[PDB]
């Protein structure tokens, strides 16, 4: 089979800047008869189906912005994008269709960098209908923080541990290019009311000192 | 008005067979072939093969030679895909796509998502999340909803029925104890919260659950 290699496997760039992706085929895709390389690039955003950007290695399909380009012949191709913008947040695939089986590259993930940002955290105690049922989830939100890595832990203070502290992450924001996670602290009620203060600890590039957000066993 | 419409997400248990459809619209189904492409959670795209729409002949890619068939129904201008005796690893999204002469796919289905698992269908429970007004007041407020203990995949989430869009962050479910957890996040000026009303909408086709939740101040 024709084996498709893509590089790099991920890339992070800033807005306005030129991004270049490469695709190499294990053998040529030049079609003798046609005079056309049977090479196509697709983009695919979180949640969606893929959509073509380029076909015949260098033909741009109607409605894709001219900032998208490709080139190459044989076995070396590239995809260039002249101004990356948050909307260009996605995975890009090349696909050959020279001789079957049709095969894809394992895809280049394109992510934007931008100016650092502090998260915006927010604590939430559990909630009646839930209390009522037996559990006690507690929840925190670190939405809109730039560098993607981040950690987290739970403390009823001198207590700081976990079990059932499940967190989640989202893909890079299409608007503002940042990142966010939810943190979701499972206990039980009989226990939640037996313990203390209840805090949130938010470690990021943007602070020596953590961001701490702790709550009302005073309103609650 | 030019499209492939694909059947809803499937939940199967190991051993079962599944059969997914893809319905053309807005084009002469006969003029082109249909192919198929899947993709496991978090991975890249794998070509499964194609079927000739003007003779029914299905060429399969060696990875899916076996338990996969490709049929048709031209007269309903539909393609289908059958997978025999499921297995875990068949967990994936499957795609339908129209192939053009110029050697690219033009029109993709949305994909039907196959979930291969023994876990039992369950509904969420929803819980609101509100600002307690125990230590701070900011200009802007972060309401949340939280969607707990359910199976299988999907649950949709909306804020004000769709109207609140612009500062949400709904989270990928996170499997655990054969159960999933989501949650959602919203940010409205406070100049609007009290005030305007903010409710979130959750749905779980599998459990036929629809549920609205207003988020009521503290």
């Amino acid at each position: 089979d024709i084996v498709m290699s893509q590089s790099p496997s991920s890339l992070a760039v800033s807005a306005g800047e030129k991004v270049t992706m490469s695709c190499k085929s294990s053998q040529s895709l030049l079609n003798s008869r046609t005079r056309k390389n049977y090479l196509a690039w697709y983009q695919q955003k979180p949640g969606q189906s893929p959509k073509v950007l380029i076909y015949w290695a260098s033909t741009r399909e109607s409605g894709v912005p001219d900032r998208f380009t490709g080139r190459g012949s044989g076995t070396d191709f590239t995809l260039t994008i002249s101004s990356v913008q948050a909307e260009d947040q996605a995975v890009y695939y090349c696909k050959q269709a020279y001789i079957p089986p049709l095969t894809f590259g394992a895809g280049t993930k394109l992510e934007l960098k931008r100016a650092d940002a502090a998260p915006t955290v927010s604590i939430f105690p559990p909630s009646s209908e839930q209390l009522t049922s037996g559990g006690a989830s507690v929840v925190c939100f670190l939405n809109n923080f730039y560098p993607k890595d981040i950690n987290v832990k739970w403390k009823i203070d001198g207590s700081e541990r976990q079990n059932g502290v499940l967190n989640s992450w989202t893909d890079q924001d299409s608007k503002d290019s940042t990142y966010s996670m939810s943190s979701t602290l499972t206990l039980t009620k009989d226990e939640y009311e037996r313990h203390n203060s209840y805090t949130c600890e938010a470690t990021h590039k943007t602070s020596t000192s953590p961001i701490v957000k702790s709550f009302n066993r005073n309103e609650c | 008005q030019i499209q492939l419409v694909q059947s809803g997400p499937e939940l199967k248990k190991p051993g079962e067979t599944v059969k997914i459809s893809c319905k053309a619209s807005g084009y002469t189904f006969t003029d082109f072939s249909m192919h198929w492409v899947n993709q496991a959670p978090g991975k890249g795209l794998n070509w499964m093969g194609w079927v000739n729409t003007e003779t029914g002949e299905p060429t399969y890619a060696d990875d899916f030679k076996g338990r996969f068939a490709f049929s048709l129904e031209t007269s309903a201008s539909t393609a289908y895909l059958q997978i025999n005796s499921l297995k875990n690893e068949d967990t994936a999204t499957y795609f339908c796509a129209r192939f053009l002469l110029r050697q690219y796919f033009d029109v993709w289905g949305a994909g039907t998502t196959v979930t291969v698992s023994s876990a039992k269908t369950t509904p969420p429970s929803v819980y609101p999340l509100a600002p307690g007004s125990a230590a701070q007041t900011n200009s802007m407020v972060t309401l949340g909803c939280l969607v707990k203990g359910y199976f299988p995949e999907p649950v949709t989430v909306t804020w004000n029925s769709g109207s609140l869009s612009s500062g949400v962050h709904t989270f990928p479910a996170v499997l655990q104890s054969d159960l999933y957890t989501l949650s959602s996040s919203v940010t409205v000026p406070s100049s609007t919260w009290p005030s305007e009303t903010v409710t979130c909408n959750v749905a779980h086709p599998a459990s036929s659950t629809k549920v609205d939740k207003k988020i009521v101040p503290r």
Partner: protein
């Protein structure tokens, strides 16, 4: 995809910075890294580099023009 991952900082002339990761065996990866640099070379010119963390990170500096 990840069998090893080679992180690279791309560092061009006027100090813009991009950053890239590589897929695969320590050796096909290290090579797609260099082959990627070369491709960029073509416009951004010649480079140098210094390897850190067991060669499992790499900074590649382009000379501009």
């Amino acid at each position: 995809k990840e069998e090893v991952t080679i992180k690279v900082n791309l560092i061009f002339a006027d100090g813009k910075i991009q950053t890239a990761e590589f897929k695969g065996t320590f050796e096909e990866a290290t090579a797609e890294a260099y082959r990627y640099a070369d491709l960029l070379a073509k416009v951004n010119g010649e480079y140098t580099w210094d390897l850190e963390d067991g060669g499992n990170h790499m900074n590649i500096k382009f000379a501009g023009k």
